[PDB]
Amino acid sequence: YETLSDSE
Amino acid sequence: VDMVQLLKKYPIVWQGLLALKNDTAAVQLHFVSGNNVLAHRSLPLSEGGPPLRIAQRMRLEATQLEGVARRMTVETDYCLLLALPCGRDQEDVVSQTESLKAAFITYLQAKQAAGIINVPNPGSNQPAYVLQIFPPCEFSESHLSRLAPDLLASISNISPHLMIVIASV
Structure with missing residues (x-):
């Protein structure tokens, strides 16, 4: 599922 | 959008915000299908519901949709x-819709993917839960009309929304 782009 | 019809079959399970990059959209989650307990155990809260962050993505392929349907x-x-964008008032709703369309809708549809949100089960602390945020694509509405015609009739006007699939494993 890839790795999207949030805040961690 | 009449919730009074749809909530009789599938009521709201969560209300809070979604967050990816730095863009948030306050959304309220109506139950559609599946196990409602899955939502209660996946959707986190403290004050009302911390913003669900999109940490992964599932490229929605025709082949993938088959696999999705199998577990659906x-x-x-x-x-x-x-x-759905949950606004305090009509104006607020518009703003949330506007933000959601640009931040989640446009992005997810641009990727042709599923906004994957990993949550841990309370007490278990294992993020082995996948909330798949699918854009307002034909695939979504097609299953929605079949699974929840009661709520579907409300979302036909608020098409700018997300279809979130909570998957165990």
């Missing part, structure tokens, strides 16, 4: 939710 036809393994 088994209500228990997945939960189907309908996230």
Whole structure:
């Protein structure tokens, strides 16, 4: 599922 | 959008915000299909519900959709939710819709993917839960009309929304 782009 | 029809079959399971990059959208999640307990155990809260962050993505392929459908036809393994922009008032709703369209809708549809949100089960602390945020694509509405015609009739006007699939494993 890839790795999207949030805040961690 | 009449919730009074749809909530009789599938009521709201969560209300809070979604967050990816730095863009948030306050959304309320109506139950659609699957196991409602999955939502209660996946959707986190403290004050009302911390913003669900999009940490992964599932490229929605025709082949993928087959696999999704396979686990969608088994209500228990997945939960189907309908996230709609929850505004305090009409104006607020517009703003949330506007933000959601640009931040989540446009992005997810641009990727042709599923906004994957990993949550841990309370007490278990294992993020082995996948909330798949599918854009307002034909695939979504097609299953939505079949699974929840009651709520579907409300979302036909608020098409700018997300279809969130909670999958165990």
